[PDB]
Design a protein around this nucleic acid. Structure first.
Length: 51
DNA sequence: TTCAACTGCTTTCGCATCCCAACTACTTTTCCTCACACTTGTACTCCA
């Protein structure tokens, strides 16, 4: 499992719903850092990071 | 019959070598992502 895997399962659930989103948008949305892809370890768990 | 060291005493209460640390390095802990060499047919004609 990798951060490539949490976007892939975010895309399988998108290509189930017949959505006009594509992997162009999933690779655009993280470079603009809208959804928490890069450095998501920092502020989100707050206690599972330390151990 | 004398010189020279050994001698205890001035008050009266209360005041008053071993360890630690610094910063910058290098390294390990592992987990994740793919390639590089091998092989049978098939294809394009090859010589019969």
């Amino acid at each position: 499992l990798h951060m490539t895997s949490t976007i892939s399962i975010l895309y399988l659930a998108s290509t189930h719903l017949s959505l006009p989103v594509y992997t162009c948008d999933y690779i655009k949305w993280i470079c603009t850092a809208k959804m928490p892809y890069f450095q998501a370890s920092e502020i989100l768990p707050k206690s599972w990071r330390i151990q």
